[PDB]
Design a protein around this ligand. Structure first.
Ligand SMILES: CC(=O)N[C@@H]1[C@@H](O[C@@H]2O[C@H](C(=O)O)[C@@H](O[C@@H]3O[C@H](CO)[C@@H](O)[C@H](O[C@@H]4O[C@H](C(=O)O)[C@@H](O)[C@H](O)[C@H]4O)[C@H]3NC(C)=O)[C@H](O)[C@H]2O)[C@H](O)[C@@H](CO)O[C@H]1O
Ligand SMILES: CC(=O)N[C@@H]1[C@@H](O[C@@H]2O[C@H](C(=O)O)[C@@H](O[C@@H]3O[C@H](CO)[C@@H](O)[C@H](O[C@@H]4O[C@H](C(=O)O)[C@@H](O)[C@H](O)[C@H]4O)[C@H]3NC(C)=O)[C@H](O)[C@H]2O)[C@H](O)[C@@H](CO)O[C@H]1O
Ligand SMILES: [Zn+2]
Ligand SMILES: [Zn+2]
Lengths: 606, 616
């Protein structure tokens, strides 16, 4: 219950600071060709070309059966593809006309806008079943908001804002309809409906609040800021958005890790940023959380979690490959004043020249034009501390100067997109995974089990799913580079374990993994596993060797263990696109069976 | 002011006799597969096939720019081509699904209906400028009705009627938006707006009432009969529709003749037929002008006017080639009980088996199913009296047993689609034009307003008529025939054409007369002038192979017909070639036609010309 926006002003003080008549708008007027020439630079001629390709684009109809198919077979893309292609084209066209100025894309901008008003809803088939009727087909009677409708409304607003005057010369009915559509599909349902789930009024513990919230709110706000000119009305809506987005802020951890991973980041924390950007712009700076310590942490997670060459720390159900919108990262950085975020984004360009964000998020596409000539001139470096320690989320990254990076976690077995992986670690060498976390396929799914994480099977028994299957006493020593936790309570009763302390210590030349255990009873041998890939050898007892994408390490293990290599064929292409054909589980097993014991494992380059 | 419908019933009568809950509908229940099979005959398999080809039809969106083009450049097709494709597809899919009844086309029918409700309007871009704002782009705030939307409406309503149960199983919001679309776009504008030009409330002398009136009213009425279940509202809507259509019935001439010719007939008299048929069906037989002799004449006009092998009488700005929807001509014929029209329809089939009417007009399409089996059994015959005389319109048709047909007219030079053509004639031999009426051209700017009569097709000079003292007819109401008679038994048309020429003509009397016997047409002129200024000149339009074997003889051989034209030897005969640049004319006539000019030195205040045409 931080309530940081509610604290930063109430409805009344808000009224005094709001900027009316769209004076907040940081882009030029449409008709100011010289000011658009400056901003655009090298973007101009490409955005044009991108418009030229859409001069004969046929705006795609979305038949009823496409929404019907959601109910029938669950197919989403039959509806989403023509929709999204239409959004993209409108956005592209918007960008092209702002580039060229010479009227040439107005006719198509007008068609797109006119078609969009003809549609019954802007809501996706998959999300329409939240309406009263619970149906997949749009009901003219009722509007709700989902991620799509919000983005659509926002782009229709910007196109209204920029193009009303040449639209009104041609025929003033087109802009009139646009204002009716935005009213009836955004502004009105957003004020009159309390119960939309993502608004998070009526939230009680357990229920989810996620990326929907800053995202939809960010778009709602743009609409209201662009389309609503009555001052009492505006203030009422902007405040309602702040009471909603405070509910997201009071649910995410202060340490500022996105616990779903770096793919979710651009639309979770990245949209919280966009909401706070838009709010600041639209109060001339005076309501801004952009200086808050927690927002900068939420931003820097994207840099921290990025190891290199596309390789990201991929806890829970996430991909080992990933990336980011450099142009967003840069803007997010600058705004919160992270030199690390700003240089990181330039590094992420990988020697490319940055061009304007295309896609369908008009805001981001517009904001991408502002940033361009700054980020083009910023210098590429990914420097960061040897340790990052998220104490609440319980994520720990540690590295050394010879290319070893270790991620470690505690947590609990009901994290977002949970994996049963309390205590697990991942080791990268010069960016390349060597002890890996499998990641996301397209708890009887193997990727989900502790069995296929870097963890023991205590008395032979894996981790159970659940809230109360958890780390105790997770600690990090930031100068020593020691992570430690007690994973015992992640295991069910039959594990019969008082303490099992897993610990990770990175020094400049090796990583030392220790387990240290007290059983209530020795029922069956412990088994310890490691995941890897490439060329795994066993050159002598107590020694595993791994050579992969040019890196070479040795894993020393206790000689009481017999190591085997299990091969895992990846049929699932969402795994085989990352790793390839196959990865291995190493299995360390034994006949020994003691009530109290420990193991020590050492990984180093050779 | 006949007011035939208002006389046949007032609102109070109409309510006692209206049929509610669509019990008037004459087609089987969509569910009654055996009844449809029997009705469908061998239509079933060909309709199912038409539907098969549309199972993946992508419904066309109509972009704003398509509507904007009517204002920018006057282009109609950019908008209408996709619209008509959408309708045809929907109408077809309706027929297919009725035929097959297994639910295979329901998804596409559902798509068509839903897509149509998302459209702002069903009005053609060319007609929208009649809306308040006066623009060609739809305005979500306002609906007017035109030929398109009325048509789109009736189709939607029939789709709703047949397919509601299957639609509701899938998702009941579609049929709901269907009921709302029809209501805002048809039922409410029709009820609430007095001032749509085609309704002709507020009609004043010298304003136009035309096919739009019976056409739109017939479609509005369908929507009301299918969609309005409140009897008080329905009766008020139907009575409104009767008041409106009376204005059309009042406007046309009782003698039956459609004076623009047969090319409007289908959607003029044809659509007045549909409207009475619908109204009859609507009132369980009780309100019906189908027994009215005037309606029967209007139907039979199409029969009498159709000479044969594509050729029709073409006074005024009309095409010498014409045709007919046999299935409609049959239904119209049976309902007014005109054997001539029924036999005619069969003749017009040209040996073809009659299959279901496709297109986009749901009413004709469905009605066609009912009439296919009978029309197939009908014997083809194009018989009719030797003489048909339309006395108000001043059209006279005369024919003999050896293959000659003469059309002649008196009239006035301000008829619909007027040609300066008082007194002219057209001669056909075995259905082939021999002395012709050139007909309709591609429109120019000159076509309308002054300069109309600088276009040759429009002048008496290029019709079958004299130039009195070297002067042709003038445009205008007052320039007209006097003493038009027709002796129906002697086959003699006669008329005084003097008053159709201006002052400069200096003409008291000119009697042009036509006599047909069993072999030859005798054209006679007999004139009295005020002052003989210039010599007279007499013209005849023709085509094919024209020769001049001797003085006072002309031979014409065309499409295997051959005649001789005997003319007073006082005249010097020349042949003017008329090359036809205009495709609209060359597609009927070929490369060229000819005007035979007959010039003289003679000059007198009174005199007398005889001409004779017969087969050789
Ligand atoms: C069916 C349902 O209601 N399920 C909810 C579930 O909702 C689903 O969540 C996803 C999410 O990310 O939260 C949504 O996935 C994203 O939807 C976006 C628009 O529909 C789409 O744009 C995202 O894809 C991205 O596109 C960007 C772009 O616009 O260009 C790219 O920059 C980006 O790289 C790309 O990833 C799409 N994300 C994907 C595919 O990863 C989904 O729409 C939504 O239905 C809720 O989140 C959960 C929470 O409890 O409840 C379920 O029941
Ligand atoms: C622009 C305007 O307002 N003009 C009016 C003028 O109206 C015009 O009248 C035409 C007419 O001949 O009556 C109309 O032409 C018809 O329009 C229909 C839709 O475009 C079309 O269906 C007709 O074509 C026929 O369609 C039938 C069918 O499928 O139902 C078939 O049986 C047939 O094969 C097919 O040829 C079409 N008529 C044609 C081609 O002759 C036109 O829409 C309309 O603009 C008024 O008559 C005058 C008089 O006051 O005023 C003008 O300003
Ligand atoms: Zn995992
Ligand atoms: Zn003519």
């Amino acid at each position: 219950e931080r309530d940081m926006l509610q604290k930063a002003a109430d409805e009344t003080t808000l009224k005094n600071v709001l900027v009316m008549k769209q004076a907040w708008v940081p882009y030029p007027a449409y008709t100011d060709r010289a000011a658009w020439d400056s901003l655009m630079g090298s973007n101009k001629q490409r955005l044009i070309a991108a418009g030229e390709k859409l001069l004969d684009y046929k705006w795609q109809l979305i038949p009823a059966t496409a929404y019907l198919e959601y109910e029938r077979t669950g197919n989403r893309k039959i509806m989403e593809v023509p929709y999204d292609a239409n959004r993209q084209a409108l956005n592209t066209l918007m960008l092209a006309e702002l580039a060229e100025g010479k009227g040439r894309f107005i006719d198509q901008l007008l068609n797109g806008a006119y078609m969009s008003c003809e549609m019954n809803s802007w809501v996706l088939s998959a999300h329409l079943p939240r309406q009263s009727s619970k149906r997949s087909l749009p009901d003219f009677r009722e509007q709700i908001i989902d991620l799509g409708s919000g983005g659509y409304g926002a782009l229709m607003a910007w196109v209204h804002y920029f193009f009303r005057k040449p639209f009104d010369k041609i025929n003033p009915v087109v802009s009139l309809q646009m204002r009716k559509a935005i009213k009836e599909r955004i502004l009105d349902p957003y004020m009159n409906d309390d119960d939309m789930w993502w608004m998070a009024f009526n939230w009680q513990p357990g229920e989810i609040i996620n990326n929907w919230n800053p995202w939809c709110n960010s778009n709602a706000l743009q609409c209201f800021l662009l389309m609503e000119n009555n001052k009492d009305r505006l203030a009422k809506a902007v405040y309602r958005s702040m009471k909603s987005v405070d509910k997201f802020i009071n649910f995410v951890k202060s340490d500022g890790a996105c616990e779903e991973g770096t793919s979710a980041w651009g639309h979770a924390a990245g949209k919280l940023y966009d909401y706070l950007q838009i709010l600041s712009d639209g109060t001339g700076g005076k309501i801004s959380l952009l200086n808050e310590p927690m927002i900068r942490r939420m931003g820097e997670y994207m840099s921290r979690s990025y190891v290199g060459n596309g390789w990201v720390v991929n806890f829970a159900d996430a991909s080992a490959q990933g990336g980011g919108d450099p142009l967003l990262i840069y803007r997010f950085g600058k705004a919160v004043n992270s030199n690390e975020m700003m240089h990181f984004a330039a590094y992420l360009l990988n020697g490319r020249k940055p061009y304007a964000t295309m896609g369908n998020d008009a805001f981001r596409s517009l904001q991408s034009l502002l940033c361009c000539n700054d980020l083009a001139k910023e210098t590429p470096k990914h420097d960061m501390p040897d340790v990052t320690w998220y104490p609440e989320t319980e994520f720990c990254y540690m590295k050394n100067k010879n290319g070893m990076f270790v991620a470690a976690k505690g947590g609990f077995n009901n994290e977002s997109h949970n994996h049963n992986d309390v205590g697990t670690f991942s080791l990268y060498v010069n960016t390349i995974p060597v002890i890996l976390d499998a990641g996301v396929g397209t708890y009887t799914i193997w990727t989900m089990q502790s069995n296929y994480h870097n963890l023991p099977m205590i008395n032979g028994i894996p981790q159970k799913y659940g809230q109360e299957y958890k780390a105790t006493n997770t600690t990090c020593n930031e100068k020593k580079r020691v992570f430690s936790t007690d994973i015992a309570a992640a295991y069910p009763s039959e594990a019969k374990v008082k303490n099992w302390i897993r610990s990770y210590t990175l020094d400049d030349r090796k990583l030392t993994i220790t387990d240290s255990y007290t059983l209530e009873e020795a029922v069956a041998p412990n088994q310890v596993n490691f995941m890897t890939w490439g060329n795994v050898t066993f050159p002598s007892q107590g020694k595993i060797q791994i050579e992969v994408k040019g890196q070479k390490v040795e894993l020393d293990y206790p000689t009481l263990f017999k190591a085997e290599l299990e091969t895992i064929q990846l049929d699932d292409p969402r795994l085989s696109n990352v790793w390839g054909k196959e990865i291995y589980r190493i299995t360390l097993k034994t006949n020994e069976k003691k009530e109290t014991g420990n193991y020590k494992f050492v990984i180093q380059q050779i």
